[PDB]
Amino acid sequence: GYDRALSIFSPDGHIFQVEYALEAVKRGTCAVGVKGKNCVVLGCERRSTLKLQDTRITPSKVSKIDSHVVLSFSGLNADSRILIEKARVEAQSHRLTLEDPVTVEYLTRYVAGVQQRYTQSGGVRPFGVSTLIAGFDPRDDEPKLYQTEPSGIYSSWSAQTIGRNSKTVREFLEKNYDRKEPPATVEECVKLTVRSLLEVVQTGAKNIEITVVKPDSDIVALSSEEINQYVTQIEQEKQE
Amino acid sequence: ILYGAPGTGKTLLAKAVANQTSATFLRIVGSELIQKYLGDGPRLCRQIFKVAGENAPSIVFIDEIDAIGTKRYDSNSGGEREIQRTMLELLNQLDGFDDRGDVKVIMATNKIETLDPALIRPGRIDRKILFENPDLSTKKKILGIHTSKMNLSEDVNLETLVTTKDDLSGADIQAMCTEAGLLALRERRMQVTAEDFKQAKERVMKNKVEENLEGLYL
Amino acid sequence: IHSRKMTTDDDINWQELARSTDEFNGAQLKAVTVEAGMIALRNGQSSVKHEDFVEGISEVQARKSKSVSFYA
Amino acid sequence: GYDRHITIFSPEGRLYQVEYAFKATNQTNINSLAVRGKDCTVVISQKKVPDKLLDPTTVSYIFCISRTIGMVVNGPIPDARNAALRAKAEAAEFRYKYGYDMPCDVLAKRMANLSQIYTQRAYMRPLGVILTFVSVDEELGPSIYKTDPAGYYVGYKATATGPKQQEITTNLENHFKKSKIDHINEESWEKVVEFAITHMIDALGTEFSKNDLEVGVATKDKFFTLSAENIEERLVAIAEQ
Amino acid sequence: FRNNYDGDTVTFSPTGRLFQVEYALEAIKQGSVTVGLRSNTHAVLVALKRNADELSSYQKKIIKCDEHMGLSLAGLAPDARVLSNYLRQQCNYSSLVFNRKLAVERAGHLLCDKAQKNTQSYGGRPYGVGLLIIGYDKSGAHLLEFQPSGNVTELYGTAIGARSQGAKTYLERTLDTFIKIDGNPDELIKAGVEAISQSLRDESLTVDNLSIAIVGKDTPFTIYDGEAVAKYI
Amino acid sequence: DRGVSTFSPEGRLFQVEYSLEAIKLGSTAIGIATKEGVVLGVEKRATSPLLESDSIEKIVEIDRHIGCAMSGLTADARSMIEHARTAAVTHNLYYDEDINVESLTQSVCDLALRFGEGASGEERLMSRPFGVALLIAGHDADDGYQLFHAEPSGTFYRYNAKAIGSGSEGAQAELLNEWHSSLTLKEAELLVLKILKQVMEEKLDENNAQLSCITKQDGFKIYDNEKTAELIKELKEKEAAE
Amino acid sequence: TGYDLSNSVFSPDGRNFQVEYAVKAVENGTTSIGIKCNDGVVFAVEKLITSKLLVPQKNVKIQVVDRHIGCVYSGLIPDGRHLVNRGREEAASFKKLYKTPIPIPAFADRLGQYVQAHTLYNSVRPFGVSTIFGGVDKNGAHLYMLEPSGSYWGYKGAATGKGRQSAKAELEKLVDHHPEGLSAREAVKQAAKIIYLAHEDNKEKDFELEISWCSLSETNGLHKFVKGDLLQEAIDFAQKEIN
Amino acid sequence: MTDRYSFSLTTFSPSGKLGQIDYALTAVKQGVTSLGIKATNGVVIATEKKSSSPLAMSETLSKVSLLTPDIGAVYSGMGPDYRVLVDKSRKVAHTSYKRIYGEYPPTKLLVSEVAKIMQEATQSGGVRPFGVSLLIAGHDEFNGFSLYQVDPSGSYFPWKATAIGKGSVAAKTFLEKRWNDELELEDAIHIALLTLKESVEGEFNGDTIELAIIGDENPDLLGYTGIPTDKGPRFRKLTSQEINDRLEAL
Amino acid sequence: VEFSLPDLEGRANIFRIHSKSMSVERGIRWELISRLCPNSTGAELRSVCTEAGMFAIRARRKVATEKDFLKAVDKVISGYKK
């Protein structure tokens, strides 16, 4: 039908190629994150069940863009690495010109433009990978969480999930998280984030990777024993 | 409208309702509606509602339609010319049939995209049930039926068997327990114990599905 | 021939109005004369005057209806 | 079918586009003869006679590339005139960069490789005409190089173009076995035209007039085409023998 | 027709006439109707302005090109903009190089060669907008009729758009009238109002939908609207 | 070739016609151009309460006295928004003056009326066809307050009251009556909220509804959530008495 | 078959259908003839009158090449002018390098390679028009007609269009009238009569006679249009013969 | 529908292997039977030439060309496909090597560069790769004697004895039949004549048979004397008159 | 005679007639929910009135509120898209 062409708008108003790109996201890994008052937390799922795989030489799913800005996504990694490289070059180009650290709003508009330009270019395949750009604005503690979609649009969310079983985790994000009063403490935002991941991970440790961003350009990576500690506290309420 | 496979989706759902409704199960093969003779299409459809049109102590059930559900554009490529005029008379018999719901017409096929928009008639059929992948709670209800007869060890509960479940809804839980009871016959015992559960489930979950759905696309 | 059978005022030019017709057979021209009388009912006329033929013959009838006055 | 519209390989290895290239060469039904003498080379092409509304002087199947070099083409006209423009351009450019005459061995090679360049272009259509190059080489002497529309060229003792080419080759083959030479006698270039036309009439089986033929002559450091009065003068000398 | 012959602009037909051009002409038939006529000393163009709804304002179909020249655009909107800037560039190029205003017969040759390049080239969409161009040069007043194929024909006056036959019938019987009127620009405009009146089906009879432009040996090309064109109405 | 071949041509172009349905799938935006100002409004279309309405904005400011709105895909809009902002600073560069609303709209439509890679007498930028529904409104020293709808298909038209989005069809039916030449600035603010509340799928609230005004004194000003909520209570008080 | 959907593709008949359709499209156009005399050539074109709104000396299809060559074609009007406008640049390009006017056989080679290459290009649509050009160069009078297929030869007379069948029979009679050919003034009266004879199929519409010629006798190698008493004499001469 | 006959120009073959290569190998199978024999002291190649018309000059067709004096080559397939390939292949050896290292290209570098042109023809769309298969034989100081079979798919492998063309499958066993790796060059030419004779029995003479050898340098083909350092050409093309001498001694 | 899709005015006149036979709330407004649905066939319009009562049974209401018609239209939009 209309999957052979791109610029054709189709009578349904939506290109079927973008919908088929969402199907790869439906089978993609689960990426969950929630931003609090003083901090933002981004979790991810990297399957360690594959045998004969060294975790030391395995690159992490969370890609460092700026000091106070990280990047998380779900989808084909071959398509994301291009988006990662184009974002990192522009990330350095921000200080190469404006001398200011990378702005979350400016970085998202660029990545959306990268999704836009390669889509508007004939004979160029668009990226069907959804990326989550989070971080704090320069000289600002207000959390900023943006997303990217294969349709070429961006939006902001307090709590958002992508990948496999995105609708199931989304129901967990609306009911158990209050935008009017986000969690103030760091432990509460991380512990509730693990509970959303335990649905798709189903009682696992090395399959969960969480990178917490702190003000004044601080990146911390929770170890395997630290992530498993939140799993034990959640299991205490289920067995009670 | 139902979706699924015979024995689970297109079978268990049809026979379970006739039990609670206290209605006689009436099965009509979808291929029998078209006899490859002109005039048998409208004749056999009117006779179905005639048996159930007196006291109406039954419900009409039709399963596994690969033929009359698709008329195509012609008498080739799986369709037939007699199917075009048969589905139209079934519409007149569906609208002309009026009761309080003692008799229902349940038809299940693979795809409804080839059906006649006339026979669809929105508002006569408000129900479209698509086959879904059950969760882990579904297996606990199927195990409880067979575990009432076959005795299980005290070290293995309903939570132990439900641990490994890969793309099986309701049909092969009985088939998996069949091998679990067959392996115990090799050890000469009538009660499956903890040593038998481990060796039996490995012979089941393995060496069955050749195609692998995996996240190594990376 | 269709105009001589129907009642007219003999003010109609059959050669000039036929310039708007394109690729019409003998049967398709019969529907054109029927549309000419339908315009008289829309204009509130008992008979069919010359202005009714000009509007119905120039408009394409029994072939294709082009409603597009704008881009696409 | 789509497989017959593509220039690339076919399932059986027989290109349908190339089969139409040789088929279009016989569309005009022109029978030309190219033979090699001793010191000279004479090529005669069949001249179709139209009505009185066409100028026979302008109508020609033979184009002059340069001195001593000449070409006869049998096939589609629109591809015949454009192919002559490419051979003339490469002839002058080769006499400048390399500063030496362009022999028919190379002159048939450039157009042969140029036809493969046209096959590599999707928008450009290859030449469907036969390019027959004749000249007198300084070393090899008389040489005939006939370039097929598919870019095939090889030297010939005697060659022709048409449906009677099989009858022309057979008639000229037995004649060359008696004298055991591929060159025509009577080294004088005026008499070479007599035999080249004589062996053509016996091969074709039909006598032609002055307007039915166009006689090209390639001599040493000179090339010219006989006019209507010169061709008529040849027919008078051929009639007496 | 569906596919087969005349499916592409390059693709020909068994008859030899490309039907893709006729498809571009179909947009002119139901487009904005315009009527025009010229004399030796004057030229007049009367164009109908269209609208979406009552809240939608009427847009002028007459676009200014040269001080002594004018044109009306009936057809596809995006195709008419490129040809507009092309004629604007040729008028300035002729004034920058040849110092003379672009001639009418010269404007038609450049406009014909402009749309012909995109027609013979594979791909692209040819121009389907009609252009009626008037101008006053040393040769006098001239009126060109530009068809979507690129054909150029000189006439005293013509009309395109919805029900263009109504004005053509008026111009045939009155052909000997407006050509003899000289030095009277008012009588030539009154003939244009009565010409479009027979063409119109009486959708909107108001003043705002009619745009009358006139050029002559004394008064240059000027677009009138509102109370300026309401005097003749 | 599906939609570019199989069709029986009437002399139409089906490339943009498929985008006409995508225009109706965009956000509903309604605005009215009066003599005392231009009141504009859009719809946020929040499918979940976690969406940030203050972070995303469906209206852009091209000039101090000229606003803009969008209904459609944001991807195709960003190319037109950056092109509209480029033409705004272009007139501020060469002529150093605020460009007119009609003059700016025609410059923005120059990109919307051209498509394709290859060309002859005009440069090209976008490599594939696109489209977006843009409502350009503002104020100048020539024609005063003006409102133009920017259509990638045809030429823009002058609308005093224009409605776009899914509710564009039924809202224009209400604009043929309630709209009047004597509507003031305060009456125009309450008239849009009365029409917007009906055409919008969700309930009227400060979060899912964002309106803005265009005047000469204040230029382009966006109604704050607190100021918008005050106008919402005035609409509910008027509907309660009727 | 699908050979017409792709340009520059060999057909089973040996010639592309699009090239064959371009030749048949010339017959749908107006009839244009020509006569090649000893001291020059004479061109005659027929133009069908659409309506009384047409102004004479406006739509004339006579095209010019340098000062010594006239040009006329038959086919699509917009397609023919683009070929002439390019030939005008070809005659000027030769004038820049060689500082001399272009001869007729050289003018055919430039337009020949121009049209024949387009028939070999898919991205360029072939021409559906047949151009007739001629004049007097330094080498004398020459006449050539460029067919839409790309083939051209020297012609003692030119015939094309719809009435080419009735015109070809009259052009062959020029040998019967005089063995040496008619003069410059006699060819104008003779070429006009052929237009009326070829007008029997076009008799449902009117016409405007347009004749142009270039010779060394009167015009002294200049392209001019027939006017004055010479134009009216050729009209009355043919009207008396058709009686 | 069926496949569009792709080289992987714009489209990968759904069958897992390119189908037109076998159709390009059909054009290779369409070629004449051409064989070669790699021995210790030399490498010999043999091929047959098409007669076509009886009046066609046999000296015009050369199926064994000269790239470098130490390296020979022989091909089977369409005529113009080999000329366009080598005309470009020569300029590659000149610029990439002879204009840098200023010497004669060795066997490893020259054969690799020839296959790169076929790789570019498969990668670049719209340009069909040429369907000729080349057997390149050469002798250098580094690797010594070498015999490589260049396939149109872009792959080459060394072969002691191999055949291409219509007899590619048939003569490959025939070469292994009468010849073994332990045999020298002198006994290899007799085997090459007996195997090639089985291809066509019509004319075995030097007119339709082009035979070439690679071996010790010949000072007559060097063109100059006085320099002991520069080695003579290791490739010597056998004249048709000299080919008949090997036929009588066969 | 070709059957086309009715407009918003056609859908409003059909819903008000069916609302007399089926029990509905006195405060519902059909000028809104019907506007949210695009042009649909006359057969699907009767389905909206029948499916509206199905969600009311799940919601346990004697009549069909405004939220009941919304779920019935969304069921038609997701399963048809006409």
Q: Is B8 among the annotated ligand-binding positions?
A: yes
Pick from B81, B110, B85, B96: which is nearest to B48 by CA? Answer: B96
What count of other Cβ atoms lies within 10 Å of the Cβ of residue B74? 11
Q: How many domains would you assign to chain G? A: 1
Report the CATH number at residue H21: 3.60.20.10
Q: Give the dihedral of Cα atoms A191, A196, A198, A201; nearest 10 deg.
A: -130
Cβ-count burial of E205 within 10 angstroms (0-12 exposed, 13-18 middle, 19+ buried)? exposed
The domain covering F1-242 belongs, at the CATH homologous superfamily level, to Aminohydrolase, N-terminal nucleophile (Ntn) domain (3.60.20.10)
Buried b (16+ CB within 10 A) or exposed e, E12-25: bbeebbbebbbbbb
- Cα distances (Å, whole numbers) of residue I73 to I5, I24, I30, I77: 16, 16, 12, 6
C-alpha to C-alpha distance for H151 and H124, rounded to whole angstroms = 18
Pick from I73, I75, I54, I23: which is nearest to B101 by CA? Answer: I54
Domain extent, residue E203, equals 3-233
Q: Which two tokens stand for residue F124?
A: 């090209």
- Alpha-helix runs per DSSP H in I1-82: 8-21, 30-36, 42-59, 66-79
**Per annotation, catalytic residue among G30, G31, G119, G131:** G30
Q: Which of G4, G23, G115, G120 to mutate to test the interface with D (most CBs of D within 10 A)?
A: G120
H or E stretch at G55? none
| φ/ψ of residue C26, rounded to 5 | -65, -30
Report the CATH number at residue A18: 3.60.20.10
Q: Which of residues 74-113 of A touch F (CB under 8 A)?
A: 112-113
C-alpha to C-alpha distance for H47 and H60, rounded to whole angstroms = 15
Which DSSP symbol is given to C1? -
Pick from F149, F145, F165, F166: which is nearest to F213 by CA? Answer: F145
Determine, for residues G149 and D77 on separate chains, whether the beta-carbon distance falls below 8 Å.
yes
Strand ranges for chain F from DSSP E: 29-33, 38-43, 59-61, 66-71, 133-139, 145-150, 157-158, 161-164, 209-214, 220-222
* Contact A176/F at CB under 8 A: no
Q: Strand, helix or coil at A100? A: coil
Domain extent, residue G46, equals 1-243
| φ/ψ of residue H47, rounded to 5 | -155, 160
- 8 A C-beta contact, residue G182 and residue G37: yes
Q: In this structure, is the dihedral angle defined by the CA atoms of residues H140, H143, H147 and H153, taken in order, positive or negative?
A: negative
For β-strands B58-65 and B24-29, DSSP reports them as parallel
C-alpha to C-alpha distance for C9 and B213, rounded to whole angstroms = 82
C-alpha to C-alpha distance for G60 and G81, rounded to whole angstroms = 12
How far is the alpha carbon of D222 from chain G, nearest alpha carbon, in Å? Answer: 23
What does the angle CA A131 – CA A132 – CA A135 come to, to the nearest 5 degrees?
A: 140
C-alpha to C-alpha distance for I81 and I74, rounded to whole angstroms = 10
Determine, for residues I47 and B128 on separate chains, whether the beta-carbon distance falls below 8 Å.
no
Spell out which residues of chain I touch residue F169, defining contact as CB-CB under 8 Å. Answer: 8
Which chains neighbour I (Cβ–Cβ under 8 Å, 3 or more pairs)?
B, F
Secondary structure, 3-state, chain B = CECCCCCCCCCHHHHHHHHHCCCEEEEEEHHHHCCCCCCHHHHHHHHHHHHCCCCCCEEEEEEEECCCCCCCCCCCCCCCHHHHHHHHHHHHHHHHCCCCCCCCEEEEECCCCCCCHHHHCECCECCCECCCCCCHHHHHHHHHHHCCCCCECCCCCHHHHCCCCCCCCCCHHHHHHHHHHHHHHHCCCCCECHHHHHHHHHHHHCCCCCCCCCCCCC
* Contact E169/G at CB under 8 A: no
C-alpha to C-alpha distance for A102 and A91, rounded to whole angstroms = 6
Which DSSP symbol is given to E97? I
Q: How many domains would you assign to chain H? A: 1
What count of other Cβ atoms lies within 10 Å of the Cβ of residue G58? 13
* Contact I59/F at CB under 8 A: no
- 8 A C-beta contact, residue E87 and residue E71: yes
What count of other Cβ atoms lies within 10 Å of the Cβ of residue G63? 24
Determine, for residues B123 and I54 on separate chains, whether the beta-carbon distance falls below 8 Å.
no
- 8 A C-beta contact, residue G160 and residue G129: no
Domain ranges of chain F: 1-242
Q: Which two tokens stand for residue I21?
A: 């036979």
What does the angle CA D216 – CA D221 – CA D222 come to, to the nearest 5 degrees?
A: 35
Contacts of D179 (CB under 8 A, 6+ apart): D185
Pick from D178, D151, D109, D208: which is nearest to D18 by CA? Answer: D151
Q: How many domains would you assign to chain A? A: 1
| φ/ψ of residue A71, rounded to 5 | -140, 130
H or E stretch at F6? none
Determine, for residues B218 and A50 on separate chains, whether the beta-carbon distance falls below 8 Å.
no
How far is the alpha carbon of F94 from chain C, nearest alpha carbon, in Å? Answer: 34
| φ/ψ of residue E134, rounded to 5 | -120, 155
What count of other Cβ atoms lies within 10 Å of the Cβ of residue H222? 14
Q: Which two tokens stand for residue D241?
A: 């023998």
Residues in chain F: 242
Contacts of E173 (CB under 8 A, 6+ apart): none
- 8 A C-beta contact, residue I24 and residue I64: yes
Q: Is B79 among the annotated ligand-binding positions?
A: no
Q: Are A and C touching by the rule of 3+ CB pairs within 8 Å?
A: no
C-alpha to C-alpha distance for I66 and B16, rounded to whole angstroms = 34
Cβ-count burial of H212 within 10 angstroms (0-12 exposed, 13-18 middle, 19+ buried)? buried
Q: Which two tokens stand for residue D228?
A: 């209507």
C-alpha to C-alpha distance for F238 and F227, rounded to whole angstroms = 17
- 8 A C-beta contact, residue G109 and residue G102: no
Measure the N-to-C terminal CA separation of chain F; round to a whole number of Å. 57
The residue whose two tokens read 């003339």 is D88
Q: Give the dihedral of Cα atoms H7, H11, H15, H18; nearest 10 deg.
A: 10
| φ/ψ of residue H188, rounded to 5 | -80, -30
Spell out which residues of chain A touch residue F77, defining contact as CB-CB under 8 Å. Answer: none
Whether G131 sits among the annotated catalytic residues: the reply is: no
Measure the N-to-C terminal CA separation of chain H; round to a whole number of Å. 55
**Candidates B121, B123, B128; nearest CB to I79:** B128
- Cα distances (Å, whole numbers) of residue A36 to A66, A104, A183: 20, 16, 5
Contacts of H127 (CB under 8 A, 6+ apart): D120, H9, H121
C-alpha to C-alpha distance for H141 and H143, rounded to whole angstroms = 6
C-alpha to C-alpha distance for G97 and G93, rounded to whole angstroms = 7
Pick from F82, F80, F53, F84: which is nearest to F66 by CA? Answer: F84
* Contact B216/A at CB under 8 A: yes
Spell out which residues of chain D touch residue G8, defining contact as CB-CB under 8 Å. Answer: 123-125
Q: Which two tokens stand for residue E111?
A: 């406009």
Pick from B203, B187, B204, B205: which is nearest to B195 by CA? Answer: B187
- Alpha-helix runs per DSSP H in A98-223: 104-120, 166-175, 186-201
Q: How many domains would you assign to chain E? A: 1
| Candidates 3.60.20.10, 3.40.50.1370, 3.40.140.10, 3.30.500.10; CATH matching D1-241 | 3.60.20.10
- Going edge to edge, which strands form the sheet with D62-66? D62-66, D69-74, D130-136, D142-147
- Cα distances (Å, whole numbers) of residue I6 to B117, B122, G63, I36: 18, 16, 60, 14
Q: Which of residues 180-209 of F touch I (CB under 8 A)?
A: 198-199, 201
Buried b (16+ CB within 10 A) or exposed e, E84-108: bebbeebbeebeeeeeebbbbebbb
- 8 A C-beta contact, residue G85 and residue E112: no
The residue whose two tokens read 């096959």 is D119
Pick from H79, H143, H76, H80: which is nearest to H112 by CA? Answer: H143
Spell out which residues of chain E touch residue G161, defining contact as CB-CB under 8 Å. Answer: none
Query: Across-strand partners of H156?
Result: H150
Pick from B186, B143, B147: which is nearest to B195 by CA? Answer: B186
Domain extent, residue A171, equals 1-240
What count of other Cβ atoms lies within 10 Å of the Cβ of residue F217? 8
C-alpha to C-alpha distance for F126 and F114, rounded to whole angstroms = 9
Q: Which two tokens stand for residue B205?
A: 């979950």
Report the CATH number at residue E219: 3.60.20.10
Q: Is B4 among the annotated ligand-binding positions?
A: yes
What does the angle CA H90 – CA H93 – CA H96 come to, to the nearest 5 degrees?
A: 135
The residue whose two tokens read 């004597």 is F182
Q: Which of D8, D17, D161 to mutate to test the interface with H (most CBs of H within 10 A)?
A: D8
* Contact G93/D at CB under 8 A: no
* Contact F110/I at CB under 8 A: no
Q: Which two tokens stand for residue B2?
A: 């139902």
- Alpha-helix runs per DSSP H in E43-137: 77-93, 104-120
How far is the alpha carbon of F163 from chain C, nearest alpha carbon, in Å? Answer: 19
Q: Which two tokens stand for residue E97?
A: 């190089």
Contacts of A1 (CB under 8 A, 6+ apart): A16, F2
- 8 A C-beta contact, residue D222 and residue D67: yes
Q: Strand, helix or coil at G235? A: helix
How far is the alpha carbon of I54 from chain B, nearest alpha carbon, in Å? Answer: 9
C-alpha to C-alpha distance for F211 and F220, rounded to whole angstroms = 11
What count of other Cβ atoms lies within 10 Å of the Cβ of residue A113? 19
Contacts of G60 (CB under 8 A, 6+ apart): G45, G47, G210, G225
- 8 A C-beta contact, residue H28 and residue H168: yes
Report the CATH number at residue G123: 3.60.20.10
> What is the chain I residue with the closest CA to B120?
I43
- 8 A C-beta contact, residue E70 and residue E230: no
Buried b (16+ CB within 10 A) or exposed e, H81-108: bbbbbbeebbebbeeebbeeeeebbbbe
